[PDB]
Scaffold this active site. Structure first.
Site, PDB file in Angstrom:
ATOM      1  N   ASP A 179       0.745  -1.254   0.000  1.00  0.00           N
ATOM      2  CA  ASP A 179       0.000   0.000   0.000  1.00  0.00           C
ATOM      3  C   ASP A 179       0.779   1.312   0.000  1.00  0.00           C
ATOM      4  O   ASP A 179       0.242   2.363   0.360  1.00  0.00           O
ATOM      5  CB  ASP A 179      -1.038  -0.026   1.125  1.00  0.00           C
ATOM      6  CG  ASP A 179      -2.129  -1.064   0.875  1.00  0.00           C
ATOM      7  OD1 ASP A 179      -2.629  -1.131  -0.269  1.00  0.00           O
ATOM      8  OD2 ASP A 179      -2.488  -1.811   1.810  1.00  0.00           O
ATOM      9  N   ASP A 185      -6.854  -4.842  -5.117  1.00  0.00           N
ATOM     10  CA  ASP A 185      -6.656  -3.469  -4.647  1.00  0.00           C
ATOM     11  C   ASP A 185      -5.287  -2.935  -5.087  1.00  0.00           C
ATOM     12  O   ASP A 185      -5.111  -1.729  -5.285  1.00  0.00           O
ATOM     13  CB  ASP A 185      -6.696  -3.374  -3.109  1.00  0.00           C
ATOM     14  CG  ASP A 185      -7.737  -4.282  -2.462  1.00  0.00           C
ATOM     15  OD1 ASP A 185      -8.250  -3.897  -1.391  1.00  0.00           O
ATOM     16  OD2 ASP A 185      -8.024  -5.381  -2.984  1.00  0.00           O
TER      17      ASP A 185
END
Length: 377
Positions: A88, A149
């Site tokens: 991330d 994601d």
């Protein structure tokens, strides 16, 4: 009309900055107040992004200065490498450091984003040909696992490649995006949340969910990450196949939008009011729809259809889910859901939902496209 909708977000944001101080919002938990952290999660960049968007819309330096302060926090976070051993890095640094570079060409911010991109490259697993999403290298459970994601973490790398001229960035991002298209996307245009590969050779093992209802279900935010994610990668790579996939996933999503215009948390659970929603999935998709449209030729009749679908989604959010700045509410839109089966904030504000909602409004009102790529690219 989007000015008044943006107005509430501006008010909520200005007040939030004075309340949060140097803290970062994540999700709410049963109230109209955000749970905060000291820049230790995967969502901190969304707050920076919101501040930057508010600054771009108003020119009001109270927003810029708040954003700059969060960037200083991110510089510290990277130097100390605090909870950054995961994929991330894109969500965190594209919307903070890269964003500042995009907004005002700050050289130190550009360096921070590049330093971050370099750290994200550490997640690449040459033997498996993928970016490892979670856990330390070699993690028994997630050592060879990817998640949809992650498509949104690739822009940071692609941007870094264009900034440095180092072909490795594009090579890795392209490989990961293509592998995602083949294994995370299903034949009926739905999608898996995550997928496992053999860390030793990259052999495909199986698909599996984490935040969806079941391994074979369709987590709506996951579907949303696919829509915007594949479109962003298609822009960078000039890959028509990735754009096609974004469109297929978008049509799949759109055909399953309920009467009020905002999706439930998973498409494969009872599609009735008793089921939790995920306003954040709709917000992400609104941005994805606009991104897709921006890559289609004016002569393509579906272009306007994608644009209108986006406007309709934002309208549905504004009218049925948006918070008015009543001096107390801390979120832009209600009913987002973080991890339903885990019982984690299933009917709450999500800072990512708020960011994408605002990005959609800025795209529609000012043509401001966020911080996934340089303006004009």
């Amino acid at each position: 009309m989007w000015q008044q909708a943006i107005g509430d977000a501006l008010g909520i944001t200005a007040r939030n900055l004075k309340k949060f101080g140097d803290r970062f919002p994540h999700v709410s938990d049963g109230s109209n107040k955000y749970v905060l952290n000291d820049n230790t999660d995967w969502t901190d960049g969304f707050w920076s992004g919101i501040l930057w968007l508010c600054y771009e819309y108003t020119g009001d330096e109270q927003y810029r200065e708040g954003a700059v302060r969060t960037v200083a926090s991110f510089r510290e976070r990277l130097d100390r490498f605090e909870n950054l051993d995961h994929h991330d890095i894109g969500f965190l640094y594209s919307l903070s450091a890269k964003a500042q570079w995009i907004v005002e060409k700050d050289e130190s911010a550009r360096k921070l984003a590049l330093d971050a991109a370099d750290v994200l490259m550490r997640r690449w697993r040459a033997d498996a040909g993928i970016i490892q999403a979670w856990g330390p290298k070699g993690d028994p459970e997630n050592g060879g696992r990817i998640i949809i994601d992650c498509l949104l973490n690739l822009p940071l790398l692609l941007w870094a490649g264009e900034q440095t001229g180092d072909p490795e960035y594009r090579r890795v991002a392209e490989a990961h995006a293509l592998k995602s298209r083949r294994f995370l996307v299903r034949g009926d245009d739905s999608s898996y949340h995550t997928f496992y590969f053999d860390p030793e050779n990259g052999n495909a093992i199986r698909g599996g969910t984490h935040q969806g209802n079941t391994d074979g279900s369709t987590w709506t935010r996951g579907q949303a990450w696919g829509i915007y994610g594949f479109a962003l990668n298609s822009r960078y790579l000039g890959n028509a196949d990735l754009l096609e996939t974004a469109k297929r996933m978008a049509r799949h999503f759109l055909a399953r939008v309920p009467e009020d215009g905002v999706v439930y948390w998973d498409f494969e659970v009872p599609q009735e009011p008793s089921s939790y929603r995920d306003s954040s999935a709709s917000a992400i998709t609104a941005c994805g729809l606009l991104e897709i449209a921006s890559q289609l030729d004016e002569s393509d009749p579906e272009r306007q259809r994608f644009i209108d679908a986006a406007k309709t989604t934002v309208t549905a959010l504004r009218d049925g889910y948006a918070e008015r700045d009543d001096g107390e509410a801390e979120g832009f839109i209600r009913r987002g859901s973080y991890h339903v089966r885990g019982g984690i904030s299933p009917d709450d504000y999500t800072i990512w939902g708020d960011y994408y909602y605002l990005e959609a409004l800025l795209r529609l009102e000012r043509g401001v496209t966020g911080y996934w790529y340089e303006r004009g690219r």
